[PDB]
Design an enzyme around this catalytic site. Structure first.
Site, PDB file in Angstrom:
ATOM      1  CD  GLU A  72       0.577 -34.551   2.625  1.00 40.52           C
ATOM      2  OE1 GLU A  72       0.838 -35.595   3.256  1.00 40.52           O
ATOM      3  OE2 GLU A  72      -0.400 -34.444   1.858  1.00 40.52           O
ATOM      4  CB  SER A  83      -1.650  -3.136  -7.014  1.00 44.93           C
ATOM      5  OG  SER A  83      -2.010  -3.283  -5.653  1.00 44.93           O
ATOM      6  CG  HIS A 120      -2.027  -0.985   1.131  1.00 46.30           C
ATOM      7  ND1 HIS A 120      -2.888  -1.223   2.180  1.00 46.30           N
ATOM      8  CD2 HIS A 120      -2.396  -1.827   0.140  1.00 46.30           C
ATOM      9  CE1 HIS A 120      -3.743  -2.168   1.836  1.00 46.30           C
ATOM     10  NE2 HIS A 120      -3.465  -2.554   0.604  1.00 46.30           N
ATOM     11  CE  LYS A 151     -11.254 -10.343 -10.375  1.00 43.29           C
ATOM     12  NZ  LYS A 151     -10.148 -11.146  -9.816  1.00 43.29           N
ATOM     13  CG  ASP A 152     -10.598 -10.436  -3.156  1.00 40.00           C
ATOM     14  OD1 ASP A 152     -10.118 -11.019  -4.150  1.00 40.00           O
ATOM     15  OD2 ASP A 152     -10.102  -9.400  -2.668  1.00 40.00           O
TER      16      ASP A 152
END
Ligand SMILES: CCCCCCCCCCCCCCCCCC(=O)OC[C@H](COP(=O)(O)OCCN)OC(=O)CCCCCCCCCCCCCCCCC
Ligand code: HEM
Ligand code: HEM
Lengths: 83, 378, 100, 55, 89, 73
Positions: free
Chosen positions: B270, B204, B200, B226-227
């Site tokens: 794993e 972005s 921030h 959207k998230d």
């Protein structure tokens, strides 16, 4: 020719008001209308319209002030909701 | 004027979630930030319930886990949420890193370095948690990786008898790994806040790599829904994984109790740690293996220092695009080779896959970049 | 020479003539490129931010322009390169003055 | 059909909260009915209720 | 209501606004309303009719927003929509 | 990176936006979506897949050579 067609279409019979306010006489005003507007001889529109609702922005960053209008749809002429 | 723009909490919430200027271009690959956040808080919550029903001692750990998965109501779905949420957490983490490496977002420096520190922290946390169920695979995984820490001369053997809690994998090792697995995700959350803070600060990215300073749209309420959409897709994948085939990713060899005498034939991590184990056993040298692993993640540290191109993204560079997809297929090849036994064709192509990994990153990216810099007359 | 044929095929298949961009709309911006962008005439700068905003729009919808409006290699009006060369020359001159 | 639905349950907010609560309860009832119906319709036979009815 | 009465009466004064009113009142309405009837329709207005008609027109519609100038901080259209109605906010 | 207002500088640019209650949800979702997905697929598989068919060949060839090494005995 388009201007003559415009003038010869719109200005005829019901859609003109001779309005007269102030220190005159109604008899004289009616008589002068009767005199001069003779021979005008007047003898088909107004659909409802679509209130879309949208946003237009014209961004110009070189100006000192921002001008923003916003409107919703008003009722029209013939409502007490107008009052 | 307003509640939001004066209050000291809601200024933080305003510069995070409401009026953060985000670009109007980011594809579905910019959902995995929020998906890693939701997976992280889901791991914290479901693990907290598991830690309410768990007794960390080498006598009764496996018995207590069986008590969770049989006797406590819904302990089986909470335990399966925790394990497969770890698996989906590393799926979304490698997709997050693949985005940030492909679209040229490694021109950011401090966000990228705090990212790599978060990668170290999540890998160590998930390994300690995988030690916690106290099965056969957990026992030998703890033993072999602690001796990998003992590989280094002049520091190693004292350090490893120091973190052994004795001279082998005793009670104290299980309790130490319980405590560090039970504390480290809070440090991961704090460094995630620091990560997000430097983001921030800067601003972005977008799929073109062109700076998008003209076309920022606010975060709410476009990217919030959207998230939410991304979160619903992630929860349905996670929940179908825990309700239809819970054993499709997990190890069969875990569910035996910890016998320190047997050493099963097919020892393996794993599945998320296969390529770390594949770089290791494809180099016939102890210090060379552990140093090559540490040099792999330090190569991910190195990656901002080789941006010698002049575009930003790899959207517009097809040669580096094809080389990046060779890199992706090579990492998936390393994962597959790590998830196998060790014989002659596997030995050869494990060595060749590790060599081609280092050759793609440290050599082929700048050679493709300098052909790009030559070819468009710059 | 055939290397010009490689360059023409590469400018075709590179993907930045698809979105209506010219050569210098995709430049990565460090301090030098930010200076060379600030050193521009007004009309080229407005045309530049307009092409950039159309590119971000078309990549938001993930739709790519019709055939009659792709930027063509024959009229490659690359323009940002002289200012960027001047920035690099003055920066290297300042660096050499600091070194000696 | 839709106009009455917007005129009733979507102008105010409290009525919207009331109808999402009442709809969630009705959906709870009918959805659990449908879920147990389908699940004991594709596993007819080998389920404990019929074996209890043997006894 | 006091501002409406004062603005209307102070506007319809002189000659030119009076004659403008005669023109627009015979075209749009069909008759020029004397101001006693406007006083009657003001007396037919309390707070209840005002809040019901404003809930009928302002509340939860799609605006036409028109901006000119330095309007980067002007919200996107869905922020105008989420600010239009209330969940009591 | 900061809030709105002091980011860029734009001259005359006009943006039109229609209301979301005005327009449909899915505009022609099965007459343009299928050519768009076939176009975006055809413009990427020639750069994505020729490493993955090499991975498929490596998987099959390694399986066949491990069976070669063990199926003589
Ligand atoms: C198993 C892997 C599955 C991968 C599936 C990828 C599907 C999409 C492929 C694709 O379409 O690639 C081309 C595309 C180009 O970029 P874009 O501009 O968005 O596209 C417009 C025109 N294609 O690019 C994209 O759409 C995305 C490009 C790839 C971004 C994600 C990278 C994948 C994960 C990499 C993991 C490894 C990273 C390094 C880890 C190191 C750890 C030590
Ligand atoms: C602990 C796990 C991590 C979490 C929870 C996390 C979280 C986030 C979040 C929430 C964002 C902002 C949203 C986004 O841009 O996608 C972000 C951005 C970013 N992260 Fe991470 N991150 C993690 C690990 C990493 C790692 C390992 C790297 C690689 C070093 C990394 C590199 C980046 C980059 C480059 C961005 C900016 C991407 C952009 O602006 O497009 N992150 N991260
Ligand atoms: C602070 C938050 C966390 C708590 C309280 C927590 C708690 C636990 C507990 C009690 C166990 C033992 C139960 C079991 O083994 O199934 C466990 C195991 C495990 N945890 Fe965590 N954990 C946390 C965070 C994480 C994170 C962030 C990861 C990685 C994404 C993770 C991955 C694992 C794994 C892989 C196991 C082994 C699961 C198994 O084999 O059954 N945990 N955790």
């Amino acid at each position: 020719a388009d201007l003559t067609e415009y003038l010869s279409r719109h200005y005829k019979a019901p859609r003109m008001v001779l309005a007269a306010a102030g220190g005159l006489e109604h008899r004289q005003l009616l008589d002068l209308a009767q005199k001069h507007f003779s021979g005008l001889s007047g003898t088909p529109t107004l659909t409802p319209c679509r209130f879309t609702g949208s946003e237009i922005r014209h961004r110009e960053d070189g100006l000192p002030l921002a001008h923003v209008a916003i409107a919703v749809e008003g009722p029209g002429w013939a409502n007490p909701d107008n009052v | 004027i307003n509640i939001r723009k004066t209050h000291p909490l809601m200024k933080i919430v305003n510069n995070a979630f409401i009026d953060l200027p985000a670009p109007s271009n980011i594809s579905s690959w910019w959902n995995f930030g929020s998906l890693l956040g939701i997976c992280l808080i889901l791991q914290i919550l479901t693990g907290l319930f598991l830690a309410m029903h768990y007794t960390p001692d080498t006598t009764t750990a496996f018995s207590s886990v069986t008590h969770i998965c049989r006797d406590v109501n819904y302990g089986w779905i909470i335990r399966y949420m925790h394990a497969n949420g770890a698996s989906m957490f590393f799926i979304c983490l490698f997709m997050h890193v693949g985005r940030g490496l492909y679209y040229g977002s490694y021109t950011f420096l401090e966000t990228w370095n705090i990212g790599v520190i978060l990668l170290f922290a999540t890998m160590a946390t998930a390994f300690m948690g995988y030690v916690l169920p106290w099965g056969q695979m957990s026992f030998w995984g703890a033993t072999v990786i602690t001796n990998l820490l003992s590989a280094i001369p002049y520091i190693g053997t004292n350090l490893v008898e120091w973190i052994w809690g004795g001279f082998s994998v005793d009670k104290a090792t299980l309790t130490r790994f319980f405590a560090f697995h039970f504390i480290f995700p809070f440090i991961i959350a704090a460094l995630a806040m620091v990560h997000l803070l430097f983001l921030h600060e800067t601003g972005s990215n977008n799929p073109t790599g062109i700076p998008s300073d003209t076309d920022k749209i606010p975060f709410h309420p476009y990217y919030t829904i959207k998230d939410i959409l991304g979160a619903i897709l992630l929860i349905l994948i996670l929940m179908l994984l825990v309700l239809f085939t819970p054993d499709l990713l997990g190890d069969p060899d875990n569910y035996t109790p910890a016998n320190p005498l047997n050493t099963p034939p097919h020892i393996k991590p794993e599945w998320y740690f296969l390529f770390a184990y594949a770089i290791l056993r494809s180099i016939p040298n102890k210090l060379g293996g552990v140093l090559a692993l540490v040099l792999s993640i330090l190569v991910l540290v190195i990656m901002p220092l080789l941006h010698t191109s002049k575009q930003r993204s790899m959207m517009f560079r097809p040669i580096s695009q094809c080389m990046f997809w060779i890199l992706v297929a090579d990492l998936l090849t390393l994962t597959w080779i790590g998830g196998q036994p060790v014989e002659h064709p596997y030995i050869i192509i494990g060595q060749l896959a590790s060599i081609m990994y280092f050759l793609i990153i440290l050599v082929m990216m700048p050679v493709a970049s300098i052909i790009e810099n030559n070819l468009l007359k710059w | 020479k055939w290397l010009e044929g490689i360059r023409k095929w590469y400018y075709n298949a590179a993907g930045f003539n698809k979105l209506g961009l010219m050569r210098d709309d995709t430049i990565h911006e460090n301090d030098d490129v930010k200076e060379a962008i600030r050193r521009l005439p007004e009309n080229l700068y407005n045309d530049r931010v307009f092409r950039i905003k159309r590119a971000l729009d078309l990549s938001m919808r993930q739709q790519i322009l019709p055939k009659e409006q792709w930027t063509k290699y024959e009229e490659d009006k690359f323009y940002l390169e002289p200012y960027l060369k001047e920035v690099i020359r003055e920066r290297k001159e300042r660096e050499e003055w600091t070194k000696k | 059909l839709t106009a009455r639905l917007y005129s009733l349950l979507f102008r105010r907010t409290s009525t919207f909260a009331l109808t999402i609560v009442v709809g969630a309860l009705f959906f709870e009832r009918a959805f659990d009915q449908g879920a147990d119906a389908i699940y004991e319709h594709i596993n007819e036979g080998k389920l404990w209720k019929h074996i209890k009815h043997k006894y | 209501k006091n501002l409406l009465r004062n603005a209307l009466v102070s506007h319809l004064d002189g000659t030119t606004p009076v004659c403008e009113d005669i023109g627009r009142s015979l075209l749009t309405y069909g008759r020029r309303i004397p101001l006693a009837e406007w006083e009657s329709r003001i007396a037919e207005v309390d707070a209840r009719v005002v809040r019901e008609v404003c809930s009928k027109y302002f509340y939860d519609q799609c605006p036409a927003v028109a901006g000119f100038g330095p309007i980067e901080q002007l919200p996107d259209y869905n922020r105008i929509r989420s600010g239009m109605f209330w969940l009591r906010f | 990176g900061r809030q709105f207002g002091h980011l860029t500088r734009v001259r005359h640019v006009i943006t039109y936006s229609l209301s979301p209650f005005e327009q449909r949800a899915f505009p022609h979702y099965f007459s343009k979506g299928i050519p768009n997905v076939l176009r975006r697929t055809r413009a990427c598989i020639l750069r994505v897949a020729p490493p993955f068919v090499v991975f498929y060949l490596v998987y099959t060839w390694g399986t066949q050579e491990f069976e070669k090494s063990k199926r003589k005995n």
